[PDB]
Each structure stands twice: as structure tokens, then as C-alpha cells.
Paper text:
Centromeric chromatin in fission yeast is distinguished by the presence of nucleosomes containing the histone H3 variant Cnp1CENP-A. Cell cycle–specific deposition of Cnp1 requires the Mis16–Mis18–Mis19 complex, which is thought to direct recruitment of Scm3-chaperoned Cnp1/histone H4 dimers to DNA. Mis16 is a homologue of the human WD40-repeat protein RbAp46/48, a well-known histone chaperone found in a variety of chromatin-associated complexes, whereas Mis19 seems to form a bridge between Mis16 and Mis18 with its N terminus binding Mis18 and C terminus binding Mis16. Current structural and biochemical data suggest a model in which Mis18 provides the principal link to the centromere, whereas Mis16 is responsible for recruitment of the Scm3–Cnp1–H4 complex, which allows Cnp1–H4 dimers to be inserted into chromatin as a prelude to complete nucleosome assembly. As expected, Mis16 adopts a β-propeller fold, consisting of 7 WD-40 repeats, with an extended N-terminal α-helix that forms part of the histone interaction pocket.
We first solved the crystal structure of S. pombe Mis16 both alone and with the N terminus (residues 14–44) of histone H4 bound at 1.9 and 1.8 Å resolution, respectively. Overall, the structure of S. pombe Mis16 and its interactions with histone H4 closely resemble those of the homologous Schizosaccharomyces japonicus Mis16 and the human RbAp46/48 proteins and exhibit a highly conserved interface, which has been extensively described by others. Residues 56–63 form a β-strand that continues β-propeller 7 of Mis16 and stabilises an extended loop from 107 to 116, which is disordered in the Mis16 structure alone.
Numbering used by the authors: 20 to 102, 119 to 360, 368 to 422
Amino acid sequence: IDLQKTIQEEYKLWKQNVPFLYDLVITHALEWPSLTIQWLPDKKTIPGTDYSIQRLILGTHTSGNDQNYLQIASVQLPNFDEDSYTIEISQKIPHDGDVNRARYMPQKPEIIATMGEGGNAYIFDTTCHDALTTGEALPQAVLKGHTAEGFGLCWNPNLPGNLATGAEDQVICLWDVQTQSFTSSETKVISPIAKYHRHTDIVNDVQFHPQHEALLASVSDDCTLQIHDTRLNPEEEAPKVIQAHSKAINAVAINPFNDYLLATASADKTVALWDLRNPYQRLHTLEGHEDEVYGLEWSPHDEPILASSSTDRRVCIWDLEKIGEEDGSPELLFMHGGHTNRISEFSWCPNERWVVGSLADDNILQIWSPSRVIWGRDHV
């Protein structure tokens, strides 16, 4: 793939340092760039081997006219010891537009929701897509509600089948997806159970609280963070609207261990920290990215660890326990520099500690782990 001269220089410096800064790097080019990535929760152990098989959801983003696909990639991840590996596209499911975002249902991971063409969302049941299917691979459901494409998508981890989406139409849709009717022969057409008309610009991201069924956070180009209670009536305005940044907010992430800790990522190159009990008081600002921050995700294993990604091509990992303080930001624990274009999405591996899968706009998939020399510094 074409690299500009300076980019090519940087990438070769990065590769030279990889053995010192990383315990693992696996690189792969995909036939099409993917806008989205998420590790599936399952791990398949082959007894007697030094690896396990894990899986990732990927999408495509085609130049135009060429068919798009929702994809599942199977990855050989080595076991990490205590004193090349294969990546194949397992399933490929025809998808209508670009796959702007894709998320498996936590309670039923064979069910995958996507944000696709023109604002339609789609539901796929992977057990309806296999070598035995007789006709067209169809979505199991199309969710008709948005009037423009969107990138906000989140399943409710405490209410099976409950889905939230947000789009460039400024709207948040709530959906109730009942899956026990799904078939490979028909596409169910579903309308929303509620629509929120509370943002005044593109809704970039939505996230259900991991421990509270009714709490939905949303962020927008209107520079607000909003906390909605989906028990109350839909056109009643969100009981919490925060003027959180001076520029567009692209991502929101709720700590999966600290039920009050929320993070936002913004076009002001900043990540900010928020206490949900008193959400108008910003707790801290995290600086280090050189361009807009677009992606945000807490470690699934370590409460103080947060990752962010940016059009500056970096994934940054932040250690919140270093906030209390010899010239750079102490909470910036690690900066991944393996990508040569803007990062589209990344995802923490749920089955291995300190492993990230990341994608960039130039078709590269990287699976990497920073060295325990960096993250285990205060181990014994």
C-alpha cells in the first residue's frame, strides 16, 4: 500500500522498536478497509497447543458499487507465558451499505446489529447464515427510523434485545429486537419504540450504563453529553444535559467497574473524565493526542485503564492511577504508533490481558500487546 515518505520512515522506526515496546504484534492487511471492530466474547482452546482461537467482527467500506460485507475473522492468539499466527475470514455476510458500526448482542452473541445504508440499522443472526442456506443471505431484521447514516450503536447489557442507535439526523432511536422469530428467508421490518430529539447536531455515540438498565449516555457534535433515563416518556427532555466540551464530542465510555466514572472524547484533542453523580463538574482532562479523538474504550480487566484513538493515527492508553503526578503527562502510559492512517476503531481483547485489536483507514488490522515492562512496572 502507498505510504507517503515521512509515514514510511515512521513505520520503519516503529517496527525497529517493536521488540522492546511490545510483547506481541500481529499485522494483516484486509481486502477492504473496515470502519468497525469488536472482539466476540468466546475463546476456543485447543488442548495441547500454545494458542487459542478468538474471533473479531469486522465490516467493509467499499469505494462504491462493490458489495459490502459483515465479516467474522478467526484469529490464532498465542498463550502468554509466565516465568506467525493465522487470521482467516470465517463468515462473510452480504451487507447493504458501508458497515458503519457493528456490535454483538451481549446476551446472545450470534446476533449482530449494524448501522448501514442511509440510516437503516440491520440485525443478523449468524446461525441463519451458513453453507446450508438456500436463498439470498438476507438480514434477519431491518430497523427503519433514522433519516441519515449514523455511527452510534449500543445493545442494552441488562435488557436483552434492547438497542440504541444515534445518527447524523440528530436523533436517538430505541429499539426492541425480538430474535426468536428470525429466519433466513425473511427480513423483519422494525420501527423504534422511542425517539429522542434532544441533540441539535449529529449524534456520534451512545452507550448504555453497564450496571443500570435504564441509563443511556449520548454525545454529539452539539458539544453536549446527555444522560437519558429510558423509563420516562420519550419527549420529556433528558434529566441530564452537560456542556462538556467546547468542540464536537465523538465518543463516550462508561467505566465497567466504577459505576460513576464516565469518559468523553472530543475534537478539542482531549479526553475528559466525569462523575455521573455530579456530571457538570469535569474531574480531569487527558492531553496527548495531536488531532481529534474519535475512539474510546475502558479496559475490560483493569478499572483505571482507558484507551483512546484519534486521527493523529495513535491509540493512547491512559493509567488513571498516575494522575497525581518529568516533562510529559504521567497518566499517558503507552502510545501505539503502528498505524499509518487514521484509526477507524479499536477493541480490547476480552480473553487476554493487555491485548488490543486496531484498524486504520489503509486496510491494516493489528493485534498487539504493549510490553509488561511498561504496564507491569509496579509488579513485584
